[PDB]
C-alpha cells in the first residue's frame, strides 16, 4: 500500500530492550521504552555517570557521541523535568535515549568527565530550567540577560516575559528595564473535540 | 444590632445547640420582638455566636461543645 | 552517604516580581462547548489565571493588556497535583470540583408508551 | 539517599555570611572602575534590601540554590562582562510605583 | 460616494465619524485621510439581477480562476431575489 | 444485584440493564461519533452515523437503539465499523452546502470535527447538491435551512422540554423541511438553546451574527444574573468584549440550558453603561467629574449625617461583596436601617431562620417529587430553566401538577384549584378538589412564588403556606427527609439579601424617611422625588443606568455581572462565584471597592484590603455564602411554623394574578434587559 511506512529492523533493535535490561539494576533500568526503531531508557538520577560510562567504549555498545542533551519541562508530575541524553553510534549506527526525571530543585550527576561536550549544554538547562548540575566546572549564563530573574522556559511565568519594554528614556545612557506593558499575544483556544486516536486513551 | 448564631449538621458542638435552637429560640422570638435575632447556618464549621453590639462593634464568644444550660446562659448575658 | 532529609513546605525562588500575591490561580476542568457535542476538552485539569485590564489601543483598533502572566494554560493529571503546583509557585488557588454528567438511563421503548406520558409525539 | 545540593541545614547560612563578606567589598570596584552612577553608600543599601526579600529560609536546598544564583549574577562584576550601566542596574529608578492604599490605587486604576 | 461630515473628515465603508470632543482627530491633521472612491454597497445595487429558467442554480465568479465556492441557491420564493453568501448577484424565478 | 458484565473491545466493564451501547462505551472512556443522541433529549435512530459493530452480527446496529444484554464484544475499531463512519459520511456531505465562511459556527461545528477524523479524505460525489429555502422563524434566531442535516434533534426539543409543538418534518426523500408549515413566529422561552442543540450551522443567535470564531474568543466560565434559577453559563470575550453567552452542564443548575432572556441579551450590558462619575451641577443637570472630586462630594454628606436618617436601598443587580461591604458601611458608622428592593414578608420570623428566607427543596430535587402544588405564580415568566425542570419531572416520571391563583399558559397540563386567596385557606383545612391528593403522596411540594408574595397580602399567603405545609408535612405526609414549602424569588439579589441581614421590602424607608440615601442599584419602584419629602442626596451606584439613574445627585460608575469578581446566592440556596471575563468601561469601578473607598474617603475606615480580605469578612457574618458550589439543607421547620402562625392577618379579596403573565412580558424586565438592541426588537416583534 502506497502512503505509510514500513518497519523491519524493529525486532533487531528490540534485542536492547532485554540485553541492557539484563544487566538489570534497580540503580539504572527502571521502565524501557522502543517505538519505530528507537530506544527510550528512563534511568534515576542518583545514577547517571556510571550510566553513561556504560554504552562508552564497549564492545557491544559503541556510542562515543552526545549530539543532544534535550530537556523536557512538564508540570503533571512531582518530578517537574525530565533531562534526555540524546546518544549516537558511529561503529553500529544506531541512536538511543538516556532519559532521567528531576523535581523543583536537585542536582543531577553531570557528565562532565564522561563528555567534554556536555558542559555547554548543560549551561542551557540551567538557563532555560534552572536544574542544577553537581560536579560541574564553570556554570553560566549564556542565552539569559546577565540580569535576568526566572528561567526563561518555564511553563510558571508568561511568553512575554517580564521586563520586555526597554526605553532609552530620560537617562542619558541608562536603559529601562522594570515596565511590563507590551501587545496583547491572541491566545486562541483550538482544541479539537473527539479523541481522534486508539490505543492511547486510559481508564480512570 | 442582631444577634448570630453558627449550626453545624455533625454531631459535636450542635448536640447542645439544636437543643437551644428547638426549645430556647422558639421562646426568644416571644421575649425579644423588637430585636432581630437570626441563626441562619448550616455549613460544617466551629459553633460560635458572634454577635453585634449596638453600634460599630462586634463580639463573638465560643460555643464548641458547651452545654445547653450553658448556652442559654451565656446568650442570656450577651442580650444585655 | 549524606542524605539530610528535611520536611517543609515549598518555596519559590526562581520568581518574578510583585503579582504573583494578587493575582488568584482558578485550577478548574474546562466546561464542554454548547455547540460542540465531544467530551476531548473535558478529562483534563487547566489552571488558568484570573485575567486582569484590558483597554483599546490608541495605535491602531487591538486590545492590548498590561498583564503579562494572563495567556498561558496548563495542563494537569491530577487535582492533588494541580494543588500542588499551585502551592509550589505560591498563588493562592481556589479549586472546584469536576461537574461528572449524571447517568441517565434512556431507553428507545419509553418513546412508544401506553400507560406513561412519556409518549414521543410526530417521530 | 537524599540529594543537599551543597550545605545540610546549618552550614547554608554560613555560605549567606560567606556571599554577604564578599559582595560587601565589590562595590568600590563597581564604581571606580565601572561607573559612578549613584553612590557607594547606596550601593551598600541595595545590597540590604535584596537580602530583605529573602527573609523566609525553610529548607537546606532553597538557600544553596540562591547561593549558587548569588555566585553568579553578583559574580558577573568581579569579573567585568558587558553591562555598561544600562545592565546591571537593580534598583528601578526610571517608573514611579504606586502606593499600597485603598483611596490611592482606586484613584488612578488598579485591579 | 458616502455623506460627507460636518466636521471635515470623510466617512469609511462603515458610518464612522469622529466625535467633537475626541483628540483622535490630529493625525488627519496635515496629511490626507486615505478613504477609497468606490464603495461596496452602491456597487451591490449597481449589478443587475439575472433570470434563471430552472429551479436551482449554482453561483460561481469564473471557475477555477476567481475565488467562489459552488453554492446552491433555492429560488421557490418569489418575493426578494435569492442571493448567494459571497457575491452580492441576485436570482428571480 | 442488576450488573451485567460486557466486553468493549475484550475489556470488562459493568453496567445497569436497560442502558445503551453508547452509554456502556462512556464508562470506559470511548467515544462514538453521533448527531441525534443527546444526554437530556430522548434516542432516536435518525442519521445512523453512531454505527458500532458487534461480532456475530451479519448487521451493524445503532449506539442510540440496541439496549445492552449478557455477552457482547463491541468492536469499535474493526474493519467494516471504520467502512460503516466513512460511507455514511460521504452521504451528509453530498447534499450539504459549502457554506464554511459564510456559516456562523466555525470551530464548534460537529460535522466539521468528524468527517476530519472519522470521514473520508475525498469525497466521489460529481453531480447533485440540493438547495432549500430558508423560513424566517424569529428576531433572536437565524434559520438556513439549506445546511440542515435533517437529524430530528430541534424537533424533538421543541416537542418533549420546551413543549411548543411547531416544528416538524414536512416532505419525503431530499424534499424535506424542518420547521414550521404554516410560517409562524416562533418565540418563546428556552428559545436561546435550540442554537446550541443544533449540532451543524443551521440554526444559530441572530442578535450575535457575525462577531468572532469559537477558536478566537477565549473562554470564561461564570453565573448567570438577573434570573431566579442562577444557571452557569461560559462567557466567551473576543479580546476586551463579551461577544456570545453558552450555557455550560451542571446537575444543580436545572440542566444543560440557559435562560432565552438571560443567553440572547449579551448587547444589553455594552450598549448602555456609566463610564464616568457624574455629580449635579449648579445648573441641574449631571456633569462628569474627577474620581477625587465626586468621592469627596459624596463623603461630606455621609460624615457629616448620624444615626437612623441614613438608609441604602439595594436591590437587582447586587452581589454578596456588595452585601457584606454596603452593611459594613452602615451599621458602624450610623444606625443600621438598610432596606431591599424586593418585598418579602418578615413579620414571623422571615429574615431569621434559612428555612422561611429561601426554598428547602433543591433545584434538581424537583424530579423526585409526588405532586407539586405550586402557588399564584407563572413559571414561563419568571425562571424559564425551573419551568422546563418542573415539565422533565413530568414528562419522565408520572406526578400532577396544580397551580392555583389565576390560570397561565404552562408547558405542562392543568389541575387549576380556582383563582382566590379563600381557595388557599380551605386547602389548609379538608379541602374537595384538593388536600386528598396531598395526604396520599410519597413527597409532595409546594412552591410559593415570590410575584404574589410581594402585594398587600404578604402575611396572608405565607401564613396559608406554613399552615397548610405544617399540617400536611408533620401529620402523615413527610416519611424522613422531605421539604414541604418551598420560595423562588424573582430578584437576583432578594436570596442573597435575607441570608446577610438585610430588611425585605420598602416598608422600612417608607416608616422613616432618610435624609441622604445611597441607593446601590436601583431598579424598581421604590424611591422617588415625591417619596422623599426632603433634600435629594441620592447616590446611585450601579451598572446600566436607565431608571432610577436621574433622580440621583452624585452618581457613581460600577461593574456588572461579567465585571465585578463576586458571589451570587441561588433560589435553592446555593452560593455560586462569578469570575471576571471584561475589565470595567470607562472610569467605573468593582462593588467591593467602591464602598471601601468611600469608607477611606471619610473618617470611619472598614477593615477591608483586597478580595480575600472581604471573602473572609463574609464567611465571619454568614458561613453558607463561604464554600462555592455546596448547598446545604435548614434544619427545624416546625419551629419557624409555630412562630409566623401567631401573627394576625386579614386574607385580601382580589385573586393572586402575577404581573408577568404574558409571553411579551418576559422580554423586558428588571431594567437591566430593558436598555438592550436585541430585546426591543423581539418585543416589538412579539406583538407584531
Ligand atoms: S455546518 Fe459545519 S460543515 Fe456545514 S457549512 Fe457550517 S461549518 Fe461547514
Ligand atoms: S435544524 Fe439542526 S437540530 Fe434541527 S433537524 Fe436540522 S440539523 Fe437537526
Ligand atoms: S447519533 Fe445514533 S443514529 Fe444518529
Ligand atoms: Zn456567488
Known sequence: TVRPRNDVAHKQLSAFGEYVAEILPKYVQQVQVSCFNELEICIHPDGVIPVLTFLRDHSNAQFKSLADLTAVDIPTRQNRFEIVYNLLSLRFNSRIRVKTYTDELTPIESSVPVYKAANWYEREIWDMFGVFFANHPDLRRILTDYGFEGHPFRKDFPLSGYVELRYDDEVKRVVAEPVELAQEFRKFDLNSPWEAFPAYRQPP | REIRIHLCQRSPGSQGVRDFIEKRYVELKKANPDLPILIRECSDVQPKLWARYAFGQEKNVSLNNFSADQVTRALENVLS | ITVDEKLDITTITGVPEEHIKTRKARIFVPARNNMQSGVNNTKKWKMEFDTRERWENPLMGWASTADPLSNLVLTFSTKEDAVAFAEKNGWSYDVEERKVPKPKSKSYGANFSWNKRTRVSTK | VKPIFSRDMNEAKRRVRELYRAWYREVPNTVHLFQLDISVKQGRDKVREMFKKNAHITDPRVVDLLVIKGKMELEETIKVWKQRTHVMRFFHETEAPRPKDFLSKFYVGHD | ?93 | SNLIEVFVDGQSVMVEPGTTVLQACEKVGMQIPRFCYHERLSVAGNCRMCLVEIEKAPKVVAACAMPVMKGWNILTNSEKTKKAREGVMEFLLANHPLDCPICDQGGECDLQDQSMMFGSDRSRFLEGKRAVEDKNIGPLVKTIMTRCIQCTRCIRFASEIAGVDDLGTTGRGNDMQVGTYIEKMFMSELSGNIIDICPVGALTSKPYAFTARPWETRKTESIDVMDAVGSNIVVSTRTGEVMRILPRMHEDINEEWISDKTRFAYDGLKRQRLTEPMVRNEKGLLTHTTWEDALSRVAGMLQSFQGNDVAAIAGGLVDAEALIALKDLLNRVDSDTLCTEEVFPTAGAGTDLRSNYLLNTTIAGVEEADVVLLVGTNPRFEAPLFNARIRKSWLHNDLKVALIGSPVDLTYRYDHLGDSPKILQDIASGSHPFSQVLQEAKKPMVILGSSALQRNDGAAILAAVSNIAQKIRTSSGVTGDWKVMNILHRIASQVAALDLGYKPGVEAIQKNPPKMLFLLGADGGCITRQDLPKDCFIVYQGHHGDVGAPIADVILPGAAYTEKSATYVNTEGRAQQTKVAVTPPGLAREDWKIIRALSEIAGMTLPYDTLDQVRNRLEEVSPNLVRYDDVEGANYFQQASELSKLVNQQLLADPLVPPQLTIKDFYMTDSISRASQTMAKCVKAVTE
Open chain 5, 1 to 93: 460616494g458616502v455623506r460627507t461630515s460636518p466636521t471635515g473628515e470623510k466617512v469609511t465603508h462603515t458610518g464612522q465619524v469622529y466625535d467633537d470632543g475626541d483628540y483622535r482627530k490630529v493625525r488627519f491633521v496635515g496629511r490626507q485621510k486615505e478613504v477609497n472612491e468606490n464603495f461596496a454597497i452602491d456597487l451591490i445595487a449597481e449589478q443587475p439581477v439575472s433570470q434563471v429558467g430552472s429551479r436551482v442554480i449554482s453561483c460561481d465568479g469564473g471557475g477555477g480562476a476567481l475565488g467562489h465556492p459552488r453554492v446552491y441557491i433555492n429560488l421557490d420564493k418569489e418575493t426578494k431575489t435569492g442571493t448567494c453568501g459571497y457575491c452580492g448577484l441576485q436570482f428571480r424565478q
